[PDB]
Amino acid sequence: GSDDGAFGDIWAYMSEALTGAPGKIIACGMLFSVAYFGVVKPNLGLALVSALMMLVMANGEKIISSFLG
Amino acid sequence: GSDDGAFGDIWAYMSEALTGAPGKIIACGMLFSVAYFGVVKPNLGLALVSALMMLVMANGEKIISSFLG
Amino acid sequence: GSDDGAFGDIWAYMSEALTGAPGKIIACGMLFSVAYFGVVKPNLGLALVSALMMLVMANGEKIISSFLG
Amino acid sequence: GSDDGAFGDIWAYMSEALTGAPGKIIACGMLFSVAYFGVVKPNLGLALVSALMMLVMANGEKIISSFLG
Amino acid sequence: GSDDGAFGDIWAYMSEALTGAPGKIIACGMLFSVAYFGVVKPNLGLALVSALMMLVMANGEKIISSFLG
Amino acid sequence: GSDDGAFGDIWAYMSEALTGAPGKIIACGMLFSVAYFGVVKPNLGLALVSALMMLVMANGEKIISSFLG
Amino acid sequence: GSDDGAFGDIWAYMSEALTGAPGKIIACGMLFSVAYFGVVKPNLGLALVSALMMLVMANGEKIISSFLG
Amino acid sequence: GSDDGAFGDIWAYMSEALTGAPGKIIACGMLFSVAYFGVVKPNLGLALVSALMMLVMANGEKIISSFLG
Amino acid sequence: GSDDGAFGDIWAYMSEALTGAPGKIIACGMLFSVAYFGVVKPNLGLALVSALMMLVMANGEKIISSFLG
Amino acid sequence: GSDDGAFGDIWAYMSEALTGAPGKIIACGMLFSVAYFGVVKPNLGLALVSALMMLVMANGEKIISSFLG
Amino acid sequence: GSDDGAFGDIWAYMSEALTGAPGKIIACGMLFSVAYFGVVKPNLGLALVSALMMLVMANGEKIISSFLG
Amino acid sequence: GSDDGAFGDIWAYMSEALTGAPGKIIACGMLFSVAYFGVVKPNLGLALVSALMMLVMANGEKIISSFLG
Amino acid sequence: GSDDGAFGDIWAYMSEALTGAPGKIIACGMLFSVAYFGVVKPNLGLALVSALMMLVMANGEKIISSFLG
Amino acid sequence: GSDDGAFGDIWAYMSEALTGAPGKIIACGMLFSVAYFGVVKPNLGLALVSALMMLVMANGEKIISSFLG
Amino acid sequence: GSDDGAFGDIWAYMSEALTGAPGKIIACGMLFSVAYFGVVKPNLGLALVSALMMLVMANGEKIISSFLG
Amino acid sequence: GSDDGAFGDIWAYMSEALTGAPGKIIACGMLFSVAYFGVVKPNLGLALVSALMMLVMANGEKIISSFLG
Amino acid sequence: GSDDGAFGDIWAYMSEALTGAPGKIIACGMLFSVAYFGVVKPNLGLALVSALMMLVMANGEKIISSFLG
Amino acid sequence: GSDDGAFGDIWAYMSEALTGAPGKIIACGMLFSVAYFGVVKPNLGLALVSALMMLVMANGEKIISSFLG
Amino acid sequence: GSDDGAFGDIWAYMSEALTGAPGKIIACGMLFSVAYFGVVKPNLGLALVSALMMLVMANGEKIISSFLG
Amino acid sequence: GSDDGAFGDIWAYMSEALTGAPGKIIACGMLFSVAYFGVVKPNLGLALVSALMMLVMANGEKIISSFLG
């Protein structure tokens, strides 16, 4: 695929925001949810799941560029 | 089928955009939705489903050209 | 039925366009809709439905010629 | 009824065109509409309805000749 | 009523044409309209209505002769 | 009521067609719809409903003749 | 009211046809519509509504004669 | 009922297609849906339901001919 | 039933794809789901259920051809 | 079955990924879950279950190709 | 209220049919639905609910005559 | 208000029919609808609602005469 | 305003009929409509709306005389 | 109640089918469901519940005739 | 009850399949489940329960025919 | 509040029926449900809850009159 | 409360059936459940609970009449 | 606000009916619904909610007069 | 804006009626609707919404005068 | 209580089956369970408990008839 065109700026902004401020906000929300739901039932496995999800988010642009030429 | 004609340019643009900027934008939206919905209920299977959907998108032009001569 | 006559050219163009550029454009639109609606609710069954619809489109001329003599 | 007379040629042309080029054009339009409306809401039942309508078109001359002597 | 007189030939021609070539042409037009309007909104009930109308046309002479002595 | 008159032939044809070819076509359409809608959500109760509807169709002439003298 | 006069024959024919051949034809049309619309959405309540309507038709002459002296 | 008439060919085609190519296509769609929905929640009871539905389809013509004379 | 006709090609493609590439893709999805859901709760019985479902898929064409003549 | 066709690339990618990077990621997740759940209740049998599941994953393509021709 | 008048026959027929053939048909449909829905989830309480509904139907005329003078 | 005048007879007939034959027919229709809709989803609360509606019908004349002097 | 003049009698008759026989007839029609539409969908809120409308009708003359001097 | 009338044949067919072929089919479906759901969780109490339901089905006509006069 | 009618073939097939191939498949599934669940917790009582369930399946047709006349 | 007015009769009937025949019917239904649901899971606490609910029903009119002046 | 009225017959039937045939059927079901669940875990206390529940059923009418005047 | 004017009588009637006969009827309906829905699922919290709603109804006029001057 | 002019009286009446008799009538209707819809589904949040709406109505004149000079 | 009525046959069958074939089957299951669970831990007290349970089953009809009049 080609990253340029009429929608090149939108794709660039989305890719930068995936690991940028919106992605960091979503990760912080994940951490907040993990901490909050652990008040009654402490479960640190959800922290590992959130870490894996943040790892996927960090590699989301690479996966998208690999699958879509 | 024949890729040329009066609508050849439209079909060419659509095929290139399927794996181009609009397709990448839709894939990034899929990743964003997967990350967002995992704040409360972490589910990494939806990431696999999104990967399969991006794989289908990458092969969409081939499928269309195979089915429609 | 007879494929010739005053409307022979129109019927020929429609039959060729069913599996030609307009049909391919409609199939690409189907794929785009399937990818877009899967952002929030990933459902790969709609991809199978779209594949079946493209299969019907590929055989549309044969069905029409079989039913209408 | 009698197929001859002053309007025999018009009736003959209409009967031949029902399963001829105009009928095939209308059937192709039915297929195109079914494919187009399935982009957002894939519904293959309309394909069955269109097949039944083409079956009725193929037997339209027989029905007309049976009802009208 | 009496079928003879100065207008006997006109009445005879009209009665024969009701189920003859003009009636068959009108029935074929009904079928064409049913097929055409079903491209966007497939509705096979109109086919049943057209069949009933052709049944009425086939019995039009009998009804007229029964009502008018 | 009286089954004869100017509209006796139309009523006779309608009564015979209720359990005849058009009624059988409608019943086959009911079966096709039941089979088609069961692809995604298998529901055999609709088959029982269709059987009851065909039973009503078989007794439609008797009901009409009983209600209308 | 008085059933005789200049329009006595017309009123007599209408009253006899209400439960006669035209009324039976309308009832058969009701049954056909109920069967046809039940192909996609089986609803046997419309059959009960049609039965009530035929019951009203059977008593239409009595109602008219009661209201109009 | 009588299988002949103006709509005899349509009824014959529908009856043959119920257990013919369209019926087989619908059954294959049932099998595909059963296999697809079993990816996340394996449920082999739906396979039994589909088998019963195909059994009903195989006997649909017999049921219709029994109910409608 | 008869495998030929206007829909013979569609039925042939569906039957070949049931045990072909789409069926293999669905089976691989079944295996992926079984492996993924076993991360937290290892359950190898779902593997046996998936094997039985693939066995049913392999015999789907035979079952359909046996039930539908 | 045939591994080629319109969906040949998708099936090839899925088969290679079953024992490739996604399969290895799922196996590593299995190991992580086994290690994590053993903090409070050490149970090494789940390690054997995970080893068996990885063995099934390694032979998943062979099983699918054997069952689906 | 008064049971006579222009609509006396309609009311009499409705009251007799409430506990007559149509009411018995509706009760048999209730029993059939209770038996059918108990295939997957056996629930005999719905049988008691249906018995209570039939009891209400048996006393429907009395209730209507008591409320409406 | 005054119950006499040019429209005194119409008002008297309407008031008597509210709790008379037409009102009883409407109440019987309510009972029939309650029984029919309870075939699939037994709900006896609708019977209580219908009883309340019949109670309102029985007191409709009193309410109208109280509000309108 | 002044209630006398050339149109004093018409205004007096209209004001008396608002809460007189025609108003009572309209209120009875409201009650009949509420009872009839509640056969399929029992909704007693429409009864409250009708009561409010009758309350407005009872005070219509006062409102008109207050607004128009 | 009276078993005769316009709907006497429908009621007779329903009563005979309650303990006839459709009732036996529903009972066989109950047995199949009991056997199938006992693969993972063997529960023979559901067999007793199904036996009680078949006992109710055998006495359904008697119950309906007792409740509805 | 009567084993013949429109649904005689369906009932015959279901009765033969209860102790035929589908019943044997369900029994083999019962045995497989008993063997599989005994890997961690060996319990041979479930084998006796499965034997009793197969005994019930073998006598299912007799029970159904005894309860339903 | 005032118990008289246009709706005095409706309120009186509702208050008398709360502890009258409809209230007793609802209480008997409560007892029947308690007995029925205790077949599998005997729970006599629901009997105490039903007794408390009947106590509330007996005092419903007093509560309503106390809250609403 | 008053046992008479429009719902007097329904209340009488429910009260008689509480200790009549339906109540005896529910008690027999309780005994059957107690015997069945005692195959694996013999517990005769559930028999005492069922006896107490039958005692409550025998006094249900008295309790309802005492609470509801 | 001012309670007088052209709509003073309507407002006075509505305020008196809020805690009068219509309000008492609505409260009795609330109690009936609470008792009815507690047959299957006894929930006395809905009684407390209904008591709070009646408390709000008793103070509705005060709230309206406080908010609207 | 200026409150005087040709339409000063109309604006004054509307502003006074917003918090006057018509506004109070609308608020009482809101309370009645909240009480009525809470019979089946008790929801006291709608009471808070109605209170907020009455608060907006009380400040409607101030908002209008602030926005429109 | 009365043993007759609409449910007299069901109650008679249940009472006869309590000490009949189903009761004997349940008792044999009790004996089989006692023998099976005694392989590892021989406990003949469970045999006495089963004997007491069979004694209760033999007197179940008497207890039910004594408690329920």
Ligand SMILES: CCCCCCCCCCCCCCCC(=O)OC[C@H](COP(=O)(O)OC[C@@H](O)CO)OC(=O)CCCCCCCCCCCCCCC
């Ligand atoms: C960075 C450090 C390493 C990362 C952490 C290690 C992995 C941790 C996972 C196991 C923790 C176990 C205790 C969890 C506690 C727990 O209850 O988890 C709950 C969570 C949800 O799982 P299910 O939906 O199966 O849960 C159903 C219920 O059990 C609800 O919990 O489990 C997972 O997410 C497991 C899947 C992660 C493993 C699968 C990963 C492979 C799929 C993704 C591959 C990439 C796809 C890319 C797409 C673009």
Ligand SMILES: CCCCCCCCCCCCCCCC(=O)OC[C@H](COP(=O)(O)OC[C@@H](O)CO)OC(=O)CCCCCCCCCCCCCCC
């Ligand atoms: C690239 C790496 C390999 C790809 C990933 C591996 C496959 C992953 C699938 C299983 C993950 C299981 C956990 C998911 C978590 C989950 O809940 O998923 C939810 C998602 C939606 O499934 P349903 O609509 O059945 O879900 C109903 C509810 O369960 C909602 O979840 O499941 C799927 O998409 C399964 C279908 C994928 C498998 C079918 C693929 C074959 C059809 C497409 C073939 C191509 C068609 C082409 C048309 C042109």
Ligand SMILES: CCCCCCCCCCCCCCCC(=O)OC[C@H](COP(=O)(O)OC[C@@H](O)CO)OC(=O)CCCCCCCCCCCCCCC
């Ligand atoms: C090429 C590979 C093989 C093709 C793919 C295999 C078939 C896939 C179908 C099942 C996927 C199930 C999951 C879908 C997910 C899903 O939700 O689907 C939604 C889609 C719409 O179905 P309904 O309108 O019943 O849906 C109502 C709601 O459920 C909305 O989804 O379902 C279908 O299209 C089923 C009908 C396809 C099967 C019928 C085919 C036979 C009719 C056409 C025969 C030809 C007519 C020719 C006329 C000229």
Ligand SMILES: CCCCCCCCCCCCCCCC(=O)OC[C@H](COP(=O)(O)OC[C@@H](O)CO)OC(=O)CCCCCCCCCCCCCCC
């Ligand atoms: C050649 C292969 C066999 C043909 C295909 C099998 C029949 C397919 C019908 C059912 C598919 C169900 C899913 C459809 C999906 C669907 O939504 O359909 C929509 C379409 C329109 O129906 P309605 O107007 O009832 O729909 C109202 C809304 O539901 C809009 O859909 O339904 C039909 O056409 C049903 C009538 C066909 C059955 C009636 C046929 C008998 C009348 C014609 C007899 C001949 C008259 C001759 C006059 C000369």
Ligand SMILES: CCCCCCCCCCCCCCCC(=O)OC[C@H](COP(=O)(O)OC[C@@H](O)CO)OC(=O)CCCCCCCCCCCCCCC
């Ligand atoms: C021949 C064998 C015996 C016939 C089959 C047995 C009856 C089967 C009915 C119950 C199956 C339950 C599962 C269905 C699955 C289901 O969902 O059904 C859907 C279908 C539509 O019902 P509703 O419109 O209430 O459904 C609203 C939604 O639930 C949509 O399903 O239900 C019925 O048709 C029930 C009415 C049949 C019973 C009423 C019959 C009495 C009225 C007709 C009397 C004759 C009138 C003659 C007029 C001339």
Ligand SMILES: CCCCCCCCCCCCCCCC(=O)OC[C@H](COP(=O)(O)OC[C@@H](O)CO)OC(=O)CCCCCCCCCCCCCCC
């Ligand atoms: C050929 C081999 C023998 C056939 C297979 C044996 C029967 C299998 C049924 C039980 C499997 C249980 C596990 C299923 C898993 C399951 O969840 O099923 C789901 C499916 C839908 O049932 P419901 O709509 O009750 O489900 C509501 C939810 O539970 C959704 O599942 O259940 C049925 O279809 C049961 C009805 C079949 C039995 C009724 C048959 C009698 C009616 C048809 C008679 C012919 C009518 C002819 C009209 C022309």
Ligand SMILES: CCCCCCCCCCCCCCCC(=O)OC[C@H](COP(=O)(O)OC[C@@H](O)CO)OC(=O)CCCCCCCCCCCCCCC
């Ligand atoms: C190729 C090797 C042999 C195949 C594997 C052996 C059979 C394995 C089954 C037992 C494993 C037990 C542990 C599973 C672990 C487990 O939890 O399973 C879950 C799965 C779903 O069962 P249910 O829906 O009863 O589960 C409800 C909950 O328990 C969810 O698990 O169980 C089955 O699929 C049992 C039915 C298979 C047996 C029925 C087969 C007969 C019906 C199909 C016959 C063909 C129909 C053809 C239609 C065209």
Ligand SMILES: CCCCCCCCCCCCCCCC(=O)OC[C@H](COP(=O)(O)OC[C@@H](O)CO)OC(=O)CCCCCCCCCCCCCCC
């Ligand atoms: C003749 C023998 C005696 C009759 C049977 C005894 C009563 C049986 C009721 C309890 C069985 C409990 C297990 C059911 C299993 C069950 O799930 O039931 C479902 C059914 C529907 O109830 P809901 O709509 O509350 O259910 C919501 C969900 O739970 C869906 O089930 O429950 C009822 O019908 C209870 C109301 C009957 C009791 C109210 C009767 C009083 C109102 C009618 C009075 C006459 C009005 C006349 C108007 C003209």
Ligand SMILES: CCCCCCCCCCCCCCCC(=O)OC[C@H](COP(=O)(O)OC[C@@H](O)CO)OC(=O)CCCCCCCCCCCCCCC
């Ligand atoms: C004679 C015996 C005593 C009468 C029966 C007792 C009252 C029964 C009501 C509750 C049953 C609850 C279960 C129902 C089951 C149910 O689903 O009901 C459905 C039905 C419709 O309510 P909605 O439109 O709120 O329903 C929306 C959806 O929930 C559809 O059900 O509910 C009502 O009618 C409640 C209103 C009756 C209570 C309001 C009465 C006060 C207004 C009328 C006052 C007179 C106006 C006179 C104007 C002239």
Ligand SMILES: CCCCCCCCCCCCCCCC(=O)OC[C@H](COP(=O)(O)OC[C@@H](O)CO)OC(=O)CCCCCCCCCCCCCCC
């Ligand atoms: C012919 C031989 C004698 C028949 C068998 C003996 C009765 C067997 C019942 C107990 C078995 C216990 C183990 C079951 C295993 C089990 O889990 O059962 C499940 C099944 C469903 O009960 P529930 O809906 O209470 O279950 C909620 C969950 O526990 C799901 O199981 O239980 C019943 O059906 C009990 C009701 C039968 C007893 C009530 C009968 C009286 C009502 C019907 C009277 C006739 C109404 C006629 C209307 C026309």
Ligand SMILES: CCCCCCCCCCCCCCCC(=O)OC[C@H](COP(=O)(O)OC[C@@H](O)CO)OC(=O)CCCCCCCCCCCCCCC
């Ligand atoms: C006449 C003799 C004395 C009456 C009986 C004594 C009270 C019995 C309650 C405890 C029995 C415990 C075992 C039950 C077994 C049981 O499972 O109960 C189930 C039932 C439902 O409770 P929940 O909805 O909390 O249950 C959620 C799940 O646990 C389902 O059971 O519990 C209650 O009803 C408790 C509330 C009664 C106590 C609250 C009463 C105060 C509120 C009503 C005050 C009047 C409001 C008037 C409005 C107009």
Ligand SMILES: CCCCCCCCCCCCCCCC(=O)OC[C@H](COP(=O)(O)OC[C@@H](O)CO)OC(=O)CCCCCCCCCCCCCCC
């Ligand atoms: C007179 C005696 C004292 C009154 C009773 C005490 C309060 C009872 C409430 C708690 C009972 C809990 C168990 C209920 C059982 C239950 O399930 O309730 C269901 C009912 C509906 O609540 P939701 O819509 O949140 O429920 C969603 C689902 O849970 C459906 O239940 O809950 C309430 O109404 C709670 C709100 C009452 C508390 C809020 C009051 C403040 C708002 C109103 C203030 C006045 C507004 C005036 C506007 C003009």
Ligand SMILES: CCCCCCCCCCCCCCCC(=O)OC[C@H](COP(=O)(O)OC[C@@H](O)CO)OC(=O)CCCCCCCCCCCCCCC
């Ligand atoms: C006087 C005492 C304090 C007032 C009450 C406190 C506020 C109560 C609101 C929350 C209650 C939540 C439970 C409700 C239960 C509920 O279901 O509510 C339903 C109602 C309708 O909301 P939607 O249309 O979002 O609902 C869609 C569905 O959920 C239908 O309910 O919700 C609201 O009105 C929320 C908006 C109020 C909050 C927005 C206020 C700000 C906008 C107005 C500002 C002034 C505009 C002036 C223009 C001139």
